């Protein structure tokens, strides 16, 4: 990281069609990790290739097979992009055609083009290929949306986008979580955990479905059947689907009614105002499974025992244990609830000590699995352990204030309010909105594609349809996306019969009323159906007093061990610029490592007295000892008061 | 108190709000300024909600003259490339001409965009939210409804293919790659800039950590001369903004009479700075940390005001930390000849009366054309139909029109530079 | 509440011991652990008047740490005032803040008297205001105070004072951007005006009514002003009246 | 109210000529207050008293 510089992290022209120029991390890893493009492949030498169609006399030969080519090969040829438009059969239309020649962009007559890219999405990756109306977005917001599409959470009931891009059924078949029938027959057994299909004339095929498993990121990897018993099924037809797929294709978010307008400050600076329907309709609710582990070791005093004979505990807190000291499957555990009961033989009967495993503060849910592993059962336990108990706890999380919501075009936000549906603005038919977004965030960020999807999604809801628009769709017309959206909205207006759906004066805007007063807003606003995602991640942390570091006696850091927040040197500078002296001195000594002043301050606060003056923090004494240990005679001195006296060395370590 | 507010009978953008907040702080205090800011926040939040401000695809209005402008530009480009193909111009002159052509087309389109917004729909949501200064710029409305313009390679070379589409119309695959170049460049810049900015701030903090205010006066008679910061003809920072919070080291006097405007050792508030600017002193000698002779620090009189409070600095204020933080905070906030020259076009049809007065030496311009280079500042004389010409050339100018020619309406006449 | 009950635990314990029937620290701690209703009342009467310091992770300048007064809210997120976002350079798209609580009396006094957010108005680096309204507030004020020739229902009507004009707008008699006349006596700054009176009419008396572009002043012959009518928009009336009410109160 | 305390604070910050010195005085006063009261919050009462004493 320290050696990689500006040159290495940039886009080299030779990345065209082999490495995506959009999908990367942000921060120290920007430009150092990339993603393979959609059609790119690696040959047996290790060089990335990419496919092209041959062009003979200006005619694209799609009859012949794609000719793959590496970066060095396609430097002497004039290669046209995949968005060039051809007429019936294959001839290239136009008079000037953009080409790449020797890592440069030029234009040529369409009789001197050697190769043409296979698809318009050949230059981007798979996550970036899933963003509709991408050519109406900035590249930075496209990066944000592509990165955030991979942090979406599988929801309780997934739903396909209405303005999908066409790569969704292909982006879900590779994760190996969707089950498709390889056989053209009938379905004979359907169950929550098993599917069976009998070939029209042949053997039976049986599939087992994963149910409420756990991923590396604590999400749920469910699998559900789609078909019903005694159903005619064709080969390649979807039979079961994953946790983020609906019927074949990827489904990471939900389609909700959105309006672009400011609320009473709840839209301020990327904040999001949503309705209460997203909570009680179980939209954007997810299942998260966590794993807790307990270890039975062997101490020099003795071994550790898992039992319900826990000291200093009453029978009101041992209700859900399985008469072996371990909680039962299907029990609801709240915070601080015992999961596995363990006793250690401490040395000082009334000798056992309690270190049973309990739920961390802020965690609750159902217990779904309690697996036990002991050396007797033929399991590979750790070197010094004698029992490993693992408990899995699942919970359902609803959308709430503080959660992150996102769209496919890079528009992120944090939910700041959840309004009752009789306070949210509503349509000329009585339908309250689901989310209100600030339009102040659209034009300065140049992600106009979100304003196209909404509108097309609106049409799709009204026409009971689903649109598959592919990126860079303007090779067919002058303004293809806008014309398609306007025509679709007009068609929806004619089919439904409601004139308020679409207006000719303001195409994308319709009238919206105020749910609090019933008065319409001064001007119509943009409403539509938007496909929004709920992002992962449990961040709230607080501390008063907890564990401390070994050498410096400073509080530990980390949420999982009651850690403190670091007061860096920039904050010290900020407090110095304020003129603060007492806040700074209390932060630096009494609240971090004044090993004796911490207890005095805490005792004074509890008793209600005044906090006494601090002393020398422990890190300073550690540093003086280390400097002395470096053969330095550094010391602290007290000056002599009178004349004929020597300065006296002060003993800090006392 | 006691200062009655003025009835602002005008539109209120961000500049007016900032001016009002500053006035309120200066006249009413810091808690009435807080109250006023909260009230304005409430009012703005309420009436930004009653308005129903939104964003649409038709709200992004592209001028209807974009197509004809692009057609004219492309016609000029074809003429240039045909000249290049015939050997009349060299390759770096074809490149220069097509770059200048697309930079002027971009400027014209931006002007037309702004005029179309301010003429057809002055209450457009995009125009309303970009012109009021809430969330937006002009380099962003340009890329939404105008034309993206000329971009650069990942190495720095200007790609002669410009982006001629907005985000409303949608880029092509080629324009997406050309845009992604600069997007990634900015991303990597931010990632690698954050560490450098932090390091600079740390070094600044350690150099000037011991600068605390310990004295009241060092009793000197030295200081520097504060004057406006000007780029020749134009000024960049006025003298009144540079004279606020300073302490005068000598009594200033109006240059019209013997009226004193400040005595020696007097802090300058906004009113006195404005009065000095108005009267055109152009130079004021002030005390400074540069010239104060104290004990390893500055004194209160040489420092002057603390800008967060609009008062003289207190005793024992760590001004070094404040200086380091002030320099380091905006640390993370750190195409060819366009309007930096000026084409002179005569909107008249008349004969040429240049003769042989000015020193016209034949010259080959940055494009492939040949003109006359002039270094002697001379007033152009041309029979501009009804009446003559009073045009003034500058040293080093390039005139295209020579004598014995017929100038038409808005024909290119000259080029004036503005100040291997 | 989840953060506050942990940050202020010693204070809650002290107030449970003193002002209630709690005997020892262990009983108070177990009462806090079981989330007794009394706990929240004690915490609410503890944190009032107790400043708390908020910091954003990159502290580039001294305004990156500012003191506030806590208000117990239900949720997992810290509610921040929108006017302090530019000082912290914070936006609500995933940003996080750190909360510290001063302990000693000197620390609380310093936080309230020096670091309080209501006292940080000017930028210490340039002297310019830093709590100015931005984004939606600016857009709303601009829309309120703008001029809209399309919607001018009730234009030209005269009003006794600012309150009368505001009440007329509230009913709906006069549109938001209508050009009305209000009898306002005071200093008026109107852009696009003319220092030259547009029309001067001397009546059958020593009284001249100079009619400017946005004003109508009746002045006694070789005398003083008798009345002033300002031609304005009820939105501008609302804006100026809000400013005046904030200043007077 | 909170606003009242804010106005009294601003009132004391001015006429003191040293924000630090007046913060130290408020701290001291509030300390004595709570001490001779344990026998409203200290800093608040201190500021109220000092404001009411400035006449």
């Amino acid at each position: 990281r320290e050696r990689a510089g500006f040159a290495v992290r940039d886009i080299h022209p030779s990345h065209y069609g082999r490495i995506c120029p959009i999908e990367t991390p942000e921060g120290p890893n920007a430009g150092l990790i990339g993603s393979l493009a959609t059609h790119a492949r690696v040959n047996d030498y290790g060089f990335i290739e990419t496919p092209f169609w041959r062009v003979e006399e200006g005619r694209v030969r799609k009859d012949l097979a794609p000719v793959y080519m590496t970066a060095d090969q396609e430097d002497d040829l004039r290669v046209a992009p995949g968005d060039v438009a051809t007429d019936d059969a294959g001839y290239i239309l136009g008079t000037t055609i953009p080409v790449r020649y020797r890592q440069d962009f030029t234009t040529t007559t369409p009789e001197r083009v050697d190769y043409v890219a296979l698809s318009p999405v050949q230059i981007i990756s798979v996550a970036t290929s899933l963003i509709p109306f991408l050519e109406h977005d900035d590249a930075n917001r496209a990066l944000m949306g592509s990165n955030m599409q991979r942090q979406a959470v599988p929801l309780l009931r997934p739903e396909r986008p209405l303005v999908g891009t066409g790569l969704e059924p292909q982006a879900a078949r590779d994760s190996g979580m969707v089950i498709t029938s390889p056989v053209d027959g009938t379905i004979s057994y359907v169950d929550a955990t098993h599917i069976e299909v009998t070939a029209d004339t042949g053997e039976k095929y049986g599939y087992a479905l994963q149910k409420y498993q756990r991923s590396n990121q604590d999400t749920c990897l469910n699998q559900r059947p789609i078909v019903f018993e005694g159903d005619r099924v064709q080969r390649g037809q979807v039979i079961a689907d994953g946790s983020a797929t609906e019927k074949g294709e990827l489904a990471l978010g939900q389609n909700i009614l959105v309006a672009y307008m400011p609320w009473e400050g709840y839209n301020y600076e990327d904040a999001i105002l949503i309705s209460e329907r997203l909570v009680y309709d179980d939209v954007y609710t997810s299942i998260h499974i966590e794993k807790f582990e307990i270890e039975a070791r062997q101490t020099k005093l003795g071994p550790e025992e898992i039992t319900r004979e826990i000291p200093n505990v009453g029978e009101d807190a041992l209700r859900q244990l399985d008469e072996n000291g371990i909680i039962r499957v299907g029990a609801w555990v709240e915070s601080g609830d015992i999961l596995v009961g363990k006793v250690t033989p401490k040395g000082e009967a009334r000798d056992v000590r309690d270190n049973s495993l309990r739920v961390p503060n802020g965690e609750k849910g159902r217990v779904v699995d309690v697996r036990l592993f002991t050396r007797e059962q033929g399991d590979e336990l750790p070197p010094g352990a004698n029992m490993v108990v693992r408990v899995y706890v699942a919970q359902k999380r609803k959308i709430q204030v503080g959660d992150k919501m996102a769209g496919r075009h890079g528009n992120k936000g944090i939910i700041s309010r959840i309004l009752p549906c009789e306070d949210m603005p509503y349509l000329p038919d009585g339908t309250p909105l689901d989310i209100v977004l600030n339009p102040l965030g659209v034009p300065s960020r140049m992600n106009v594609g979100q304003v196209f999807e909404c509108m097309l999604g609106w049409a799709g809801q009204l026409l009971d349809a689903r649109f598959k628009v592919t990126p860079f769709d303007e090779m067919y017309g002058a303004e293809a996306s806008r014309l398609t959206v306007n025509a679709k909205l007009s068609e929806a207006r004619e089919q439904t019969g409601q004139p308020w759906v679409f207006s000719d004066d303001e195409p994308g805007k319709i009238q919206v009323y105020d749910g609090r007063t019933g008065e319409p807003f001064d001007r119509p606003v943009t409403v539509g159906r938007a496909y929004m995602l709920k992002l992962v991640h449990d961040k709230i942390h607080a501390r008063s007093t907890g564990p401390y570091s070994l050498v410096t006696q400073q509080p530990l850091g980390g949420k999982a061990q009651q850690g403190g927040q670091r007061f860096g040197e920039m904050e010290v500078w900020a407090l110095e610029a304020y003129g603060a002296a007492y806040i700074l001195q209390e932060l630096l000594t009494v609240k971090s490592d004044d090993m004796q002043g911490r207890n005095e301050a805490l005792n004074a606060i509890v008793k209600g007295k005044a906090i006494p003056r601090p002393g020398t923090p422990e890190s300073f004494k550690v540093l003086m000892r280390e400097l002395q240990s470096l053969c330095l005679d550094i010391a602290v001195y007290k000056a002599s008061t009178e004349d004929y006296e020597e300065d006296k060395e002060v003993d800090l370590m006392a | 108190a006691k200062s009655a507010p003025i009835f602002r009978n005008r539109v209120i953008d961000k500049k007016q709000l900032k001016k009002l907040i500053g006035w309120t702080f200066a006249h009413y205090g810091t808690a009435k300024t807080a109250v006023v800011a909260d009230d304005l926040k409430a009012l703005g939040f309420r009436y930004a909600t009653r308005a129903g401000v939104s964003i649409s695809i038709d709200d992004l209005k592209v001028p209807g003259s974009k197509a004809e402008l692009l057609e004219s530009a492309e016609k000029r480009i074809q003429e240039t490339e045909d000249r290049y193909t015939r050997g009349e111009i060299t390759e770096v002159e074809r490149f220069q001409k097509v770059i200048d052509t697309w930079a002027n087309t971009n400027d014209e389109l931006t002007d037309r965009v702004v005029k179309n917004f301010r003429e057809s729909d002055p209450l457009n949501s995009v125009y309303m939210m970009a012109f009021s200064g809430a969330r937006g710029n002009i380099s962003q409305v340009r890329q939404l409804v105008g034309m993206r313009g000329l971009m650069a390679n990942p190495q720095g070379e200007i790609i002669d293919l410009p982006i001629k589409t907005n985000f409303r119309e949608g880029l092509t695959v080629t324009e997406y790659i050309i845009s992604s170049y600069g997007a990634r460049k900015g991303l990597v810049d931010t990632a690698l800039r954050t560490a450098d900015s932090g390091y600079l701030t740390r070094r600044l903090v350690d150099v000037s950590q011991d600068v605390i205010i310990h004295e009241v006066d060092c009793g000197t008679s030295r200081g520097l001369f504060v004057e406006a910061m000007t780029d020749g003809d134009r000024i960049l920072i006025p003298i009144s903004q540079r004279l606020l919070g300073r302490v005068t080291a000598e009594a200033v006097l109006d240059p019209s009479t013997d009226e004193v405007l400040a005595e020696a050792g007097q802090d300058i508030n906004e009113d006195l700075a404005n009065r000095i600017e108005k009267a055109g002193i152009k130079k004021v000698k002030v005390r400074s940390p540069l010239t104060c002779e104290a004990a390893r620090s500055v004194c209160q009189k040489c420092y002057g005001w603390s800008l967060a409070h609009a008062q003289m600095v207190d005793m024992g204020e760590a001004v070094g930390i404040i200086a380091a933080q002030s320099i380091g905070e905006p640390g993370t906030q750190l195409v060819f000849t366009g309007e930096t020259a000026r084409l002179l076009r005569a909107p008249v049809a008349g004969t040429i009366k240049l003769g042989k007065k000015a020193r016209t030496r034949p010259y080959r311009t940055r494009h492939g054309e040949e003109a006359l280079l002039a270094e002697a500042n001379f007033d152009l004389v041309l029979e501009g139909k009804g009446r003559k010409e009073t045009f003034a050339i500058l040293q080093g100018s390039t005139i295209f029109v020579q004598d014995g020619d017929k100038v038409a309406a808005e024909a290119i006449l000259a080029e004036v530079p503005v100040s291997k | 509440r989840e953060m506050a009950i942990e940050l202020f635990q010693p204070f809650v314990i002290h107030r449970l011991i003193k002002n209630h029937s709690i005997n020892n620290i262990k009983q108070a701690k177990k009462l806090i652990q079981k989330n007794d209703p009394l706990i929240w009342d004690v915490l609410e009467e503890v944190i009032e008047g107790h400043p708390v310091m908020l910091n954003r992770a990159p502290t580039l300048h001294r305004l990156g740490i500012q003191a506030f007064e806590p208000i117990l809210v239900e949720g997992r997120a810290i509610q921040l005032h929108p006017l302090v976002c530019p000082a912290f350079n914070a936006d609500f798209d995933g940003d996080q803040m750190a909360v510290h609580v001063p302990l000693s009396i000197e620390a609380q006094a310093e936080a309230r008297m020096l670091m309080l957010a209501s006292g940080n108005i000017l930028s210490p680096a340039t002297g310019q205001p830093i709590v100015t309204p931005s984004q939606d507030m600016v857009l709303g004020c601009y829309y309120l105070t703008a001029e809209n020739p399309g919607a001018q229902k009730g234009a030209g009507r005269y009003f006794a004072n600012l309150e009368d004009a505001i009440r007329a707008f509230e009913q709906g008699s006069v549109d938001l951007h209508a050009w009305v006349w209000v009898r306002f006596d005071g200093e008026v700054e109107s852009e696009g005006e003319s220092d030259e009176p547009e029309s001067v009419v001397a009546a059958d008396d020593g009284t001249v009514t100079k009619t400017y572009r946005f004003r109508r002043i009746r002045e006694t012959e070789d005398g003083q002003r008798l009345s002033q009518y300002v031609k304005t928009t009820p939105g501008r009336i609302l804006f100026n009246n809000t400013v005046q009410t904030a200043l007077i109160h | 109210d909170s606003q009242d305390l804010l106005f009294k604070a601003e009132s004391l910050i001015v006429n003191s000529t040293n924000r630090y010195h007046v913060t130290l005085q408020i701290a001291r006063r509030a300390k004595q207050a709570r001490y001779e009261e344990m026998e409203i919050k200290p800093v608040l009462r201190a500021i109220l008293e000092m404001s009411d004493e400035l006449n």
Binding site: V572, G579, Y582, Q585, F620 | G316 | - | -
Partner: peptide, 16 residues
């Protein structure tokens, strides 16, 4: 150095 040792900094309210 008063920050490192843990004394009142000689600036601000800790000036004297």
């Amino acid at each position: 150095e008063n920050v490192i040792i843990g004394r009142l900094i000689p600036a601000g309210t800790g000036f004297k």
